[PDB]
Symmetry: C2
């Protein structure tokens, strides 16, 4: 069994907590994570001005698939950049076609709407992103902190990022690995 692989797509204006918590937690789980810059190889200015250097450009990372999960951070402007990207559309449609997991948090799930991914699923988002996500009634809305309907895994905000990340770990590597990764984090529950 080869290690699982995750693609985290990092755009200008991404929520840096929603980027770093899943990357770090997935690496703790032994997942090979590629932080891929939407715009290219250069550093990315996140929503609260943390600057992250991606591992690769998305252009290069997309040639090295497939991935066991594609992860979409939130941040209002980051999600808008993901939603406008033809490269993201192609990656998500390929992942959906191959029955691979797609995980999105906060405003991130609105890129699923933009790219017509996973219609008919139960989803959650940040409260403030609900109306955008629900435009057209293509999904059924959930208030769960993490929502998983098959291969569409969504979550609500910075404060649900650990739960989101651990749900990705459980989906890829199982409940026992998720529990082992969780304990050293000092989560409240």
């Amino acid at each position: 069994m080869a290690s699982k692989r995750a693609l985290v797509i990092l755009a200008k204006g991404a929520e840096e907590m929603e980027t770093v918590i899943p990357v770090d937690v997935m690496r703790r789980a032994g997942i090979k994570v590629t932080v891929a810059g939407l715009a290219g190889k250069d550093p990315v200015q996140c929503s609260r001005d943390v600057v992250i250097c991606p591992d690769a450009s998305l252009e290069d990372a997309k040639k090295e698939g497939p991935y066991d999960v594609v992860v979409l951070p939130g941040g209002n402007l980051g999600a808008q950049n993901l939603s406008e990207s033809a490269a993201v559309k192609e990656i998500l449609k390929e992942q959906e076609n191959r029955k691979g997991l797609i995980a999105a948090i906060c405003a991130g799930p609105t890129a699923l709407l933009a790219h017509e991914i996973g219609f008919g699923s139960k989803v959650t988002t940040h409260p403030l992103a609900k109306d955008k996500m629900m435009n057209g009634g293509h999904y059924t809305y959930s208030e769960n902190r993490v929502e998983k309907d098959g291969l569409i895994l969504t979550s609500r905000g910075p404060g649900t990022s650990f739960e989101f990340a651990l749900a990705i770990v459980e989906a890829l590597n199982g409940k026992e690995v998720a529990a082992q990764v969780k304990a050293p984090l000092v989560l409240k529950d």
Copy 2:
């Protein structure tokens, strides 16, 4: 009233979640945060291989004090780098002498021990850093998720980082600002 100012000292091997969560939450609170690279101006490879570009070198940022809080992220190797640094020693002793807040998380508080800061305080750390912190009995240990004894504010792990950050916000900008910053995060409590 001018905005409060925070210095976050970023060393190789820092825990990236414990760096980014406080930076982001403090910026949401309107605090002017400087992410200062211990080693210089160049990007920093964190414990789980997230690469963060600092705002400034510590050498330059230290000339632009004083700061209302100095923040020490954890990560075992990052804290060891902070503990070995004469520049960090000088900054922490100046902050202590001026009765300014010092905040440290996970293994971060062990740099307080190394630099002889805040002896006689109640402190917490990550469970695995307790023995190092308690060598000599210079502090009294706490299992609270966040511990504040006057101007020494400590916390336990990645999963206490939001609580830690919000405690810094409350100390600097008050309980109402902390509550307002907290609500959009979708924390469980």
